[PDB]
Each structure stands twice: as structure tokens, then as C-alpha cells.
Design an enzyme around this catalytic site. Structure first.
Site, PDB file in Angstrom:
ATOM      1  N   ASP A 143      22.141  52.575  31.264  1.00 58.18           N
ATOM      2  CA  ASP A 143      22.040  52.253  29.776  1.00 58.18           C
ATOM      3  C   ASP A 143      23.204  52.140  28.896  1.00 58.18           C
ATOM      4  OD1 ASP A 143      21.042  50.280  27.846  1.00 58.18           O
ATOM      5  OD2 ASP A 143      19.628  51.963  27.234  1.00 58.18           O
ATOM      6  N   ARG A 147      25.251  51.393  21.274  1.00 59.60           N
ATOM      7  CA  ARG A 147      23.866  52.168  20.712  1.00 59.60           C
ATOM      8  C   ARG A 147      23.438  53.376  21.332  1.00 59.60           C
ATOM      9  NH1 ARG A 147      22.362  47.615  23.847  1.00 59.60           N
ATOM     10  NH2 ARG A 147      21.549  48.327  25.697  1.00 59.60           N
ATOM     11  N   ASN A 148      24.367  53.878  22.502  1.00 58.48           N
ATOM     12  CA  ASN A 148      23.932  55.069  23.007  1.00 58.48           C
ATOM     13  C   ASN A 148      24.967  56.011  23.131  1.00 58.48           C
ATOM     14  OD1 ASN A 148      21.143  54.838  24.025  1.00 58.48           O
ATOM     15  ND2 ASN A 148      21.715  53.574  25.865  1.00 58.48           N
ATOM     16  N   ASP A 161      21.864  59.270  25.317  1.00 57.03           N
ATOM     17  CA  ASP A 161      21.039  58.227  25.805  1.00 57.03           C
ATOM     18  C   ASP A 161      19.397  58.281  24.842  1.00 57.03           C
ATOM     19  OD1 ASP A 161      19.095  56.281  26.895  1.00 57.03           O
ATOM     20  OD2 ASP A 161      19.161  57.048  29.177  1.00 57.03           O
TER      21      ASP A 161
HETATM   22  O1  LIG Z   1      21.205  62.220  24.861  1.00 53.45           O
HETATM   23  C1  LIG Z   1      20.236  62.674  25.506  1.00 53.45           C
HETATM   24  N1  LIG Z   1      19.170  63.527  25.118  1.00 53.45           N
HETATM   25  C2  LIG Z   1      19.246  64.144  23.844  1.00 53.45           C
HETATM   26  C3  LIG Z   1      18.535  65.346  23.740  1.00 53.45           C
HETATM   27  C4  LIG Z   1      18.470  66.114  22.491  1.00 53.45           C
HETATM   28  C5  LIG Z   1      19.245  65.429  21.394  1.00 53.45           C
HETATM   29 CL1  LIG Z   1      18.921  66.375  19.809  1.00 53.45          CL
HETATM   30  C6  LIG Z   1      19.655  64.336  21.443  1.00 53.45           C
HETATM   31  C7  LIG Z   1      20.432  63.428  20.281  1.00 53.45           C
HETATM   32  O2  LIG Z   1      20.344  62.530  20.136  1.00 53.45           O
HETATM   33  N2  LIG Z   1      21.235  64.320  19.466  1.00 53.45           N
HETATM   34  C8  LIG Z   1      21.971  63.976  18.362  1.00 53.45           C
HETATM   35  C9  LIG Z   1      23.364  64.564  17.820  1.00 53.45           C
HETATM   36  N3  LIG Z   1      23.891  64.145  17.098  1.00 53.45           N
HETATM   37  C10 LIG Z   1      23.452  63.001  16.331  1.00 53.45           C
HETATM   38  N4  LIG Z   1      23.819  62.156  15.003  1.00 53.45           N
HETATM   39  C11 LIG Z   1      23.104  61.389  14.790  1.00 53.45           C
HETATM   40  C12 LIG Z   1      21.898  61.277  15.628  1.00 53.45           C
HETATM   41  C13 LIG Z   1      22.089  62.140  16.506  1.00 53.45           C
HETATM   42  C14 LIG Z   1      21.434  62.799  17.658  1.00 53.45           C
HETATM   43  C15 LIG Z   1      19.908  63.665  22.559  1.00 53.45           C
HETATM   44  C16 LIG Z   1      19.919  61.907  26.973  1.00 53.45           C
HETATM   45  C17 LIG Z   1      18.719  61.911  27.388  1.00 53.45           C
HETATM   46  C18 LIG Z   1      18.808  61.354  28.756  1.00 53.45           C
HETATM   47  C19 LIG Z   1      19.684  61.097  29.578  1.00 53.45           C
HETATM   48  N5  LIG Z   1      19.696  60.596  30.835  1.00 53.45           N
HETATM   49  C20 LIG Z   1      18.375  60.640  31.603  1.00 53.45           C
HETATM   50  C21 LIG Z   1      17.911  59.280  31.780  1.00 53.45           C
HETATM   51  O3  LIG Z   1      18.557  58.570  32.679  1.00 53.45           O
HETATM   52  C22 LIG Z   1      20.893  61.301  28.868  1.00 53.45           C
HETATM   53 CL2  LIG Z   1      22.506  60.872  29.967  1.00 53.45          CL
HETATM   54  C23 LIG Z   1      20.910  61.617  27.602  1.00 53.45           C
END
Ligand SMILES: O=C(Nc1ccc(Cl)c(C(=O)Nc2cnc3[nH]ccc3c2)c1)c1ccc(NCCO)c(Cl)c1
Ligand SMILES: [Cl-]
Length: 290
Positions: A143, A147-148, A161
Site C-alpha cells: 500500500d 498518504r502512508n 503504514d
Molecule cells: O507504520 C507502521 N506502524 C506504526 C506503529 C506505531 C506508530 Cl506510533 C506509528 C505511527 O504512525 N507513528 C507516527 C510518527 N510520527 C507521526 N507524525 C504524525 C503522525 C505520526 C505517526 C506507525 C506500520 C505498520 C504495519 C506495517 N506493515 C504491516 C502490514 O503489511 C508497516 Cl510497514 C508499518
């Protein structure tokens, strides 16, 4: 690294991923973390989290634990066994790349924040570098889209993601009852017709993501076509009679870079450029098109 939720101070809600909600938190003594107060992003379970959502959350921890690259979001730690579940990542202070780029326009060569064409190349190159790393893990994102992606200081990009359920991007997904949700406008023809995802279909999606970046995220891919027409376009790729259509060249995109994008949308998966090649073009070759 194991961290106590008591030592976190929650400040504001940043958004939601598929299996939890994300909060900005401060940390006073941030010694343990892998990396005034340190700011981090923390994902916790939703307040109505089911047994199934917790299971999917635990698997996300496992997947995240191996992602170790400057252009991939990084897990700094998790909450300790007795605490409610949490994941801690770096805080990308400029947030969503789609929303961030949408707030800019291409700098006028002659005469409201702006962004240069070389900086667009630098953003795209970082995404390509992150995808190059994922391909070495044989990890398929499924994906990839602006946006990701997340934006830090000085246009640093981390691929992440957020899943497919956020209201803001609902129009980017095709939903049929009982089926997997599909980002069809980013999907290679063989993904649409056969539902299977590979590094070569990530290359196709990178082409669309690159198109987004050069459109400054001001337009949806194939935006004037319906979902049904986008799905029928995949059939025209399959039949291979010269009736398939492509995304058009963005105004900010020189023809040499556009021909690279077109290669990402080759019918044959093996003819699509590897990320190693996409990164080199965007980091070097494209510089003589400035
Ligand atoms: O990103 C993944 N998980 C994840 C976990 C914990 C957090 Cl805290 C965050 C997050 O959004 N952090 C964050 C940091 N700074 C920001 N500033 C503004 C918004 C914002 C958000 C994200 C993820 C999941 C499944 C995946 N693959 C599995 C599915 O195929 C992959 Cl590759 C990635
Ligand atoms: Cl269109």
C-alpha cells in the site's frame, strides 16, 4: 527496549492506524529508548479493542521489529509486559506527506510555502531508498502511497503504514462486502485481476507515488475515471491490445523522468525497474533535468 506507560506523558492525538490510535507523547528520562523533553509517537489499542485487534497489534510489533532503515519508520520500543500494549516510534513532526506536500506549490523560477523541483527529487529518492531496503528483506509493502509516508525535519521521509480505514482517504480505496479493501488506483494490473502482491507491484505503486509527488499531491491518480473504469483498465493491460491508459505527465515532471515512471507501469513485471535503479536515477541522473 521496554518502556513504562507511566513514564509517558500524552499530549495530543496524531491519527489512527489500522490496529490502534497514535498519540504524541513527551519523555523526561529517555535513556532506555533505541532512538526539552524527547517527543515520540505512541500507538495504543483503541478503547473498544477486540481480542482480534490485540492479536493483529502483536503481529504488527513483530513486523515492525525488523524494519531498520533511515527511510522506514522505526520502532523505538514497546511497553512492558504488565502494561497495556503500546508501540513507540520516532515523531515525524511534519506528519502525513500527502497533507504536507498539498500545502506547497512549486517554486516560481522568476517571481505561501514553496518547494523546488530538486527537493521533489530528494523526497522521491528517499522513498525509493526505503523501498530498496524493504526489497532486501523480501518485504512487500502492498500500500505504498504518499498518504502512508511521514515527513520529519528538513524533508526527511519515513515510509509507514496507516492501513485502509481512515476517513480522510476513503476515496483511495475500493470496498466490496466480504473482500479485501483495495487501493486500486495504485495497483498494478496483475494485483487488480489476481490479488497478488510482489516487489514488482510495489515498483508499480512507487511510480504512482512518484506521480503524486510531482503533482504536489493535488490530484488523485486517474481522478477523472470511476473505480469501475480503473478496474477495466487493468483488463486492458492483461489483453495487451494497446488500449490501456496511463497517468499523464505532471507539469513539474520533465519527459526523462516521466519515461522512468512509464517503465514502472510496464505490463511485464520483470521489465519494471528495480528500486536500486529508481534510486540512482532520482538521486543522480535526474539532476541534469533541473
Ligand atoms: O507504520 C507502521 N506502524 C506504526 C506503529 C506505531 C506508530 Cl506510533 C506509528 C505511527 O504512525 N507513528 C507516527 C510518527 N510520527 C507521526 N507524525 C504524525 C503522525 C505520526 C505517526 C506507525 C506500520 C505498520 C504495519 C506495517 N506493515 C504491516 C502490514 O503489511 C508497516 Cl510497514 C508499518
Ligand atoms: Cl484521469
Amino acid at each position: 527496549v521496554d518502556f513504562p506507560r507511566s513514564r509517558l506523558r500524552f499530549k495530543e492525538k496524531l491519527g489512527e492506524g489500522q490496529f490502534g490510535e497514535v498519540h504524541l507523547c513527551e519523555v523526561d528520562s529517555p535513556q532506555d529508548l533505541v532512538s526539552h523533553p524527547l517527543l515520540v509517537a505512541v500507538k495504543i489499542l483503541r478503547p473498544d479493542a477486540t481480542k482480534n485487534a490485540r492479536n493483529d497489534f502483536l503481529k504488527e510489533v513483530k513486523i515492525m521489529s525488523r524494519l531498520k532503515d533511515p527511510n522506514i519508520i522505526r520502532l523505538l520500543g514497546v511497553c512492558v509486559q504488565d502494561d497495556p500494549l503500546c508501540m513507540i516510534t520516532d515523531y515525524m513532526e511534519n506528519g502525513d506527506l500527502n497533507q504536507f506536500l498539498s500545502a506547497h506549490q512549486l517554486e516560481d523560477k522568476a517571481a505561501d510555502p514553496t518547494i523546488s523541483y530538486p527537493m521533489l527529487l530528494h523526497v522521491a529518492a528517499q522513498i525509493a531508498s526505503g523501498m530498496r531496503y524493504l526489497a532486501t528483506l523480501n518485504f512487500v509493502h502492498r500500500d505504498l502511497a504518499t498518504r502512508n509516508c511521514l515527513v520529519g525535519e528538513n524533508f526527511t521521509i519515513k515510509i509507514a503504514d496507516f492501513g485502509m480505514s481512515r476517513n480522510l482517504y476513503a476515496g483511495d480505496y475500493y470496498r466490496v462486502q466480504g473482500r479485501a479493501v483495495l487501493p486500486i488506483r495504485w495497483m498494478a494490473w496483475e494485483c487488480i485481476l489476481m490479488g497478488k502482491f510482489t516487489t514488482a507491484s510495489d515498483v508499480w505503486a512507487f511510480g504512482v507515488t512518484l506521480w503524486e509527488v510531482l503533482m504536489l499531491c493535488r490530484a488523485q491518480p486517474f481522478g477523472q475515471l470511476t473505480d469501475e473504469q480503473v478496474i477495466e483498465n487493468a483488463g486492458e493491460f492483461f489483453r495487451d491490445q494497446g488500449r490501456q491508459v496511463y497517468l499523464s505527465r505532471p507539469p513539474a515532471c520533465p519527459q526523462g523522468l516521466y519515461e522512468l515512471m512509464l517503465r514502472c507501469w510496464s505490463r511485464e513485471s520483470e521489465q519494471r525497474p528495480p528500486f536500486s535503479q529508481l534510486h540512482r536515477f532520482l538521486a543522480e541522473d535526474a539532476l541534469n533535468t533541473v
